[PDB]
C-alpha cells in the first residue's frame, strides 16, 4: 500500500463475529475457502516471484521539489522574465490545488460509501471540510476565465479585499 | 534533457523579444522626433551648395 491514512483516512472496520443459528452449511464459506485454495494461492505465489525479481532489480525515483521564486506581487510590470517565473509558479500551484480538490472529493465519496444509511450524520466533518475548501477555491480561482493567470488572480484578490475593506468601514 | 533546459531557453527567448519590442518603440519615437525637428542624422533635407558661390570681387562694389 503506497498510500497513507494521514491523507486518506479510514475508520477501523468493526466486523461482527459469525453466530450461525441454522444447521445448514454456509455456501459462502465453502466457496471462499475453495476460492482461496484455487485462486489466491497461485496468484500470491506469482506475485511473490515478481516481488523478489524486483528486489533483485531494485531502482529508486524521487519527487521533484521547486524552490519558491519571487511572487508576481514583487514583479515589475513589463518585466517578462520574473513575470514568466511567477506565472509558471502560479500554474504549478493551480495544478496542485486541482489535485487537492480531487483528494477532498474522493475522501467525501469514501465517507458517503462507508457510512451508507448514516451519511447525513456521520459525514458532517467531511462535508464541512469539503465546504470550506470549496469556498476557499471559489475565493481564489473562480470566474478567472479560460486565460487564467497570476495577474488575473491577483486582480480578483485585490477586488475582493477592497470590497471587504469597504464593508469593514461600516 | 530535462525541464531546466526548456525553462532557461524560454527565459532567453523572452529577454530577446522584450529587448526587440523596446528597441522598436524607441525607434518609432526617434523617427518621430527627428522628422518633427530634424537635428539628428536622419531626415536631413537638402540645401543649396555653399561652394558654388562667387566671392571674387565683381563689377559692382555693392555686393
Curated annotation (Swiss-Prot), chain A:
One of its GO terms (cellular component) is mitochondrial inner membrane. Residues 1-25 are annotated as: Disordered. It comes from the Eukaryota. It holds the Pfam family NDUFB10. It is found in: Mitochondrion inner membrane. The modification Phosphoserine is found at residues 19, 149. GO terms for biological process: aerobic respiration; proton motive force-driven mitochondrial ATP synthesis. Complex I is composed of 45 different subunits. Interacts with CHCHD4. Accessory subunit that is involved in the functional assembly of the mitochondrial respiratory chain complex I. Complex I has an NADH dehydrogenase activity with ubiquinone as an immediate electron acceptor and mediates the transfer of electrons from NADH to the respiratory chain. Belongs to the complex I NDUFB10 subunit family. This is NADH dehydrogenase [ubiquinone] 1 beta subcomplex subunit 10.
UniProtKB/Swiss-Prot annotation, chain B:
It is found in: Mitochondrion inner membrane. It comes from the Eukaryota. Accessory subunit of the mitochondrial membrane respiratory chain NADH dehydrogenase (Complex I), that is believed not to be involved in catalysis. Complex I functions in the transfer of electrons from NADH to the respiratory chain. The immediate electron acceptor for the enzyme is believed to be ubiquinone. Complex I is composed of 45 different subunits. Belongs to the complex I NDUFB5 subunit family. This is NADH dehydrogenase [ubiquinone] 1 beta subcomplex subunit 5, mitochondrial. It comes from Mus musculus (Mouse). The chain holds residues 127 to 189 of 189 of the full protein.
Amino acid at each position: 500500500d503506497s498510500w497513507d491514512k494521514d491523507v486518506y483516512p479510514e475508520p477501523p472496520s468493526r466486523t461482527p463475529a459469525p453466530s450461525p443459528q441454522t444447521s445448514l452449511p454456509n455456501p459462502i464459506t465453502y466457496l471462499t475457502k475453495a476460492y482461496d485454495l484455487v485462486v489466491d494461492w497461485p496468484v500470491t505465489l506469482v506475485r511473490e516471484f515478481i516481488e523478489r525479481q524486483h528486489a533483485k532489480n531494485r531502482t529508486y525515483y524521487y519527487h521533484r521539489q521547486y524552490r519558491r521564486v519571487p511572487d508576481i506581487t514583487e514583479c515589475k510590470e513589463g518585466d517578462v522574465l520574473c513575470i514568466y517565473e511567477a506565472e509558471m509558479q502560479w500554474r504549478r500551484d493551480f495544478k496542485v490545488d486541482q489535485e487537492i480538490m480531487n483528494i477532498i472529493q474522493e475522501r467525501l465519496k469514501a465517507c458517503q460509501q462507508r457510512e451508507g444509511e448514516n451519511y447525513q450524520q456521520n459525514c458532517a466533518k467531511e462535508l464541512e471540510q469539503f465546504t470550506k475548501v470549496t469556498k476557499a477555491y471559489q475565493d481564489r480561482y473562480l470566474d478567472l476565465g479560460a486565460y487564467y493567470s497570476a495577474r488575473k488572480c491577483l486582480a480578483k484578490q485585490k477586488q475582493r479585499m477592497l470590497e471587504e475593506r469597504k464593508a469593514a468601514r461600516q | 534533457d530535462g525541464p531546466e533546459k526548456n525553462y532557461e531557453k524560454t527565459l532567453a527567448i523572452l529577454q530577446i523579444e522584450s529587448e526587440k519590442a523596446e528597441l522598436r518603440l524607441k525607434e518609432q519615437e526617434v523617427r518621430r522626433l527627428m522628422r518633427a525637428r530634424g537635428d539628428g542624422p536622419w531626415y536631413q533635407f537638402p540645401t543649396p551648395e555653399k561652394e558654388f558661390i562667387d566671392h571674387s570681387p565683381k563689377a559692382t562694389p555693392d555686393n
